[PDB]
Design an enzyme around this catalytic site. Sequence first.
Site, PDB file in Angstrom:
ATOM      1  N   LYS A 230      13.144 -10.969 -12.413  1.00 57.33           N
ATOM      2  CA  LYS A 230      13.074 -11.566 -13.773  1.00 57.33           C
ATOM      3  C   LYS A 230      13.326 -10.559 -15.069  1.00 57.33           C
ATOM      4  CE  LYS A 230       9.726 -13.584 -16.193  1.00 57.33           C
ATOM      5  NZ  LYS A 230       9.920 -13.844 -17.371  1.00 57.33           N
ATOM      6  N   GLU A 236      16.935  -0.655  -8.226  1.00 55.03           N
ATOM      7  CA  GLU A 236      16.923  -1.650  -6.276  1.00 55.03           C
ATOM      8  C   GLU A 236      17.828  -2.623  -6.110  1.00 55.03           C
ATOM      9  OE1 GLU A 236      13.260   1.527  -6.565  1.00 55.03           O
ATOM     10  OE2 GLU A 236      13.676  -0.568  -7.325  1.00 55.03           O
ATOM     11  N   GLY A 291       4.869 -10.895 -10.015  1.00 57.18           N
ATOM     12  CA  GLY A 291       5.663 -10.581  -7.799  1.00 57.18           C
ATOM     13  C   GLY A 291       5.056 -11.157  -6.630  1.00 57.18           C
ATOM     14  N   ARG A 292       3.585 -10.262  -6.773  1.00 57.14           N
ATOM     15  CA  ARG A 292       3.103 -10.331  -5.522  1.00 57.14           C
ATOM     16  C   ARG A 292       1.827 -12.212  -5.162  1.00 57.14           C
ATOM     17  NH1 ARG A 292       0.784  -6.730  -8.587  1.00 57.14           N
ATOM     18  NH2 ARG A 292      -1.846  -7.676  -9.409  1.00 57.14           N
ATOM     19  N   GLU A 378      -2.265  -3.931  -4.061  1.00 62.87           N
ATOM     20  CA  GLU A 378      -1.452  -3.909  -5.369  1.00 62.87           C
ATOM     21  C   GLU A 378      -2.102  -4.412  -5.772  1.00 62.87           C
ATOM     22  OE1 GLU A 378       2.766  -5.481  -6.765  1.00 62.87           O
ATOM     23  OE2 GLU A 378       3.055  -3.367  -5.909  1.00 62.87           O
ATOM     24  N   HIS A 409      -2.206  -4.381  22.428  1.00 64.14           N
ATOM     25  CA  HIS A 409      -1.614  -3.486  23.476  1.00 64.14           C
ATOM     26  C   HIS A 409      -1.187  -1.900  22.177  1.00 64.14           C
ATOM     27  CE1 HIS A 409      -2.830  -6.326  27.183  1.00 64.14           C
ATOM     28  NE2 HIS A 409      -1.847  -7.272  26.107  1.00 64.14           N
ATOM     29  N   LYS A 538       8.518   6.350 -10.296  1.00 58.64           N
ATOM     30  CA  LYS A 538      10.044   6.103 -11.141  1.00 58.64           C
ATOM     31  C   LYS A 538       9.909   6.647 -12.662  1.00 58.64           C
ATOM     32  CE  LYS A 538       9.008   0.565 -10.670  1.00 58.64           C
ATOM     33  NZ  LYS A 538       8.032   0.803  -9.652  1.00 58.64           N
TER      34      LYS A 538
END
Lengths: 575, 575
Positions: A230, A236, A291-292, A378, A409, A538
């Site tokens: 955005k 990152e 975002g999510r 979140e 399994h 952060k």
Amino acid sequence: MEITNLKSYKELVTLSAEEKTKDLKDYLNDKNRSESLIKKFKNFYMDLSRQRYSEKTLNKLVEYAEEVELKKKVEKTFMGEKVNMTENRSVLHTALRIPIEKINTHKIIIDNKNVLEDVHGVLKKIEKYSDDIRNGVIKTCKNTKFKNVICIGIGGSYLGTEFVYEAMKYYYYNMELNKNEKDQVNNFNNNYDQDNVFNVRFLANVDPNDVNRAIQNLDQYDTLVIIISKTFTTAETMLNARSIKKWLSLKIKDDENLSKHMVAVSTNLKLTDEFGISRDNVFEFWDWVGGRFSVTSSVGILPLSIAFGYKNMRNFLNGCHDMDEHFLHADLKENIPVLLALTSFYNSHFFDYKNVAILPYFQNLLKFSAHIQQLSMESNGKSVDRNNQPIHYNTCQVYFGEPGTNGQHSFYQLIHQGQVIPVELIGFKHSHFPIKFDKEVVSNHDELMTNFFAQADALAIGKTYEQVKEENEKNKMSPELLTHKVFNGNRPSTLLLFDELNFYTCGLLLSLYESRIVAEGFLLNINSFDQWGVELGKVLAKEVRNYFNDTRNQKKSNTYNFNESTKILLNYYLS
Amino acid sequence: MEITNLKSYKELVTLSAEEKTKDLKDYLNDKNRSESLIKKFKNFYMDLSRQRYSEKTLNKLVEYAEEVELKKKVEKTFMGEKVNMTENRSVLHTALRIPIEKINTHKIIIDNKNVLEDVHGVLKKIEKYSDDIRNGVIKTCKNTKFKNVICIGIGGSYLGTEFVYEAMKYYYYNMELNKNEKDQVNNFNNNYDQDNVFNVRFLANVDPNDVNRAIQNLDQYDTLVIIISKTFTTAETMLNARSIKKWLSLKIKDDENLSKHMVAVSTNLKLTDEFGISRDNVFEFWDWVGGRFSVTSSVGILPLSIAFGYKNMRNFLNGCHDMDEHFLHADLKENIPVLLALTSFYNSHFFDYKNVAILPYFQNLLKFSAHIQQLSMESNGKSVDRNNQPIHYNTCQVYFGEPGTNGQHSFYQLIHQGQVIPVELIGFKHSHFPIKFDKEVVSNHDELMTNFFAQADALAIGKTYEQVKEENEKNKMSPELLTHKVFNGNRPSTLLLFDELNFYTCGLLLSLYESRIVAEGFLLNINSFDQWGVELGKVLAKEVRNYFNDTRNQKKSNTYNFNESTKILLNYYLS
């Protein structure tokens, strides 16, 4: 006042205490209860019958949803009211999938502008751009068709996209490109090296090992790079974007050729411009898109329409929309995401079951759980209520999982005999790659599905000491060891059974969970829409960054106050 | 008598109650405590300082390990005693990695035979076979070198292998094939299309979508198929094996050519023979090798020696062995896996922290968590003690995770502000693909690592309401909202910092967790070595299988007694 003080909550405390003395095996013999707890919406069934409640207790859960004014709150969200009360923002991911024919009838006015006009302006731009990439109207710098797509983004900027990409790719290759039909099996001659089979990669980790994975066997000349951020300042994402731009520039040296290979999903037009991205190559999204909850905006619609074509993505959006309409309009007792949220709330609050296992019996859903983890955790992993009061009751569960039979399994030993973990099983009537050989007892998809039904029943019913003792009449194991073979049962499960995993159904599945999380945040009385918890890490990482910068370059700058342990490890790390 | 009745356990109940009133931020100012809680073994540091205990409380945890006779029990396991008390079996995965020079000095006699002779007989066979595949001595049916390896197996038959494969592949491609050196960065010209770059695929799910993923763009003529199953009767593995044999037979029609493309890791020589696998192509393993502890047997050593060469796998085995020796011999207070198991036990029992987040800050470790999930959960997800008494105390935690920074951008909101989740952070001093550009503040690997240190500190220290209020003097957010920005801290973490992820270190990491799980099962007084919990689901699935068979073929056979819900869903599934 807290939710724990509500009349219906205090009643659920006492009802759940009686529910704890009741067996699921007995409830599962009641056909009336089963008919009441199995709901149908479009092309799917939701089965809540292996949950530890009578129809009376589920009715009380509905009275709790009414007491917290869940319907009023969901309606305010859909209307565009500022329900994100800590950031004073609207929550309008549902507007992203409203179809064009409802642009006026379903208008949402924010700052004297119908937001659906912005939504559709972007969607028309994506349809045109993706059609042009796929038809070869828009070409690489070597005047060839693009073959690869590197999506650069963190968290919500790729999790939803990767879930949908992995879920749908084989449906697109097999049903669309190879034209496989349901009456036919064993499509081993399917071709995967043909036009419009894009090699889509997700560059998410700032770890340079992920850049290595992203660029592996790729030619810069065939590669389109999509940068999703955005602000276009995300640490990152932007370091990865600069790294991938350096990789592109090893072969693509001209700025105008470089602009043909780069696209941005952002609103920072100043920064996309500085990066060398052309204006036609910037796809917008809005602050009311979390975002999510961003996969249905350009974040996901742009790379997925390139990979699969806009028409397929329009069907996915229609799926999201139809489930959104159900969530908003259905009466609470018949509202699938609401009943799923009430079940989750009930298990966590009244049984203290702080985990949820997301177990799709479909390998193409291998990336669904990772998306559900962020979407749930979140949004709902909070400790402050909507009245700004620090709270001590349970919020979001820990979500985890692997597709069945893989998870089966791996860790089902614990799910059957260790700590109780409510499961959510997702299955389909049809495969994306049906296999069946003449001599086999069942088709491979039927073999997978025997486990979907059996696991839910084994968790619910268990196996008593006396049933173990009866089987031992033949086995003759030393009798003191029989306790090790007991299955206590009463382990809850929800079954979601769809007819097929197509684009529309994948949209129904996404919206079902986005709706469930939104409903659950209101039941928990927390703000599902902010994420203040990400700040501290952060801030402290920036201090370590400056320390690394001064140390590596042996150049003083900033004041450091590291604790005694961090000083010892930093010394090792830097030596 | 139960563990909860032990003197040292009752003392830990009261010590933990005082520990709950103490802040990690205060403990982290004590250099002496930090020096005591940071341990070094070979090429790594383990930092336990961000755990909620004083040195006195950790000493009490060591007194608890002594009271349960942990060292005696670990020694019996290593000696080959029948510690798997429900199946009456030895537990000898540690024997798999004893080097050849110790074949006599470290002999283990089971049924009047030194098991190390069987271990080395198989390892010599793997070294020869993998050397022959890699040098082109053993060729495909078209007299060319093999390019692809499809590993067919479920649970323990692939989880460990896939963890090691993904962890090591880039070290092998970059450091070995491309000869990258530590002083050099930006190795973008590395070649990945060269000799001995095997396209390894794991066919684990019985879902036919996984067969589709396994065969995608593969030519049968270049493909080696490895079938991993002790009995060679495992339902899922064998249906996948039959399916892949049918896929191979679309092009490879002769039985002797088909035998060049198929290998088995099994002991059922009758069934491998029937399958058409040659005797030289069957690699054995033993009943004292548990599935979830099988990667160091032929299960993992065979496909990994094909992919990377036996010499690299021998170094991995040496790593496992050196950590095994440390686990067996180190005094409890200096024993890294024991202290890690004691920490896990303490958090779960005394703080009721029923989850563990496995967070490697290394994208190549993307498959580590999935392996740790089975290793931990299937071993320790039990509810019956070693005295055959049903127990009610906490057993194995729910394990989950994603590599950092991915997990960080997904669910850390909950880890910081929702329910407390102890984390285990794994980091390295060096990258497998170092990147650094002149103008950047830090190398990409340093950027990743700022988060490794900062996250551990942010979880431990938090940020008080008064620190939030002080920052608000400038921000001027509405004061009632400040509670949303508080970080309570006291969230525990373990830091594991290695110099490099090479074959030897990957062995140290595997053995560290296998040792931790073995130590923890003894602390919990449960049997880590059986898995009776997987039976019920298989039995019920066989009943659904027969029902599917009769229904699909419209042919009566078996009596069915499905509950009311399953009847409704089976009707939908079959219509």
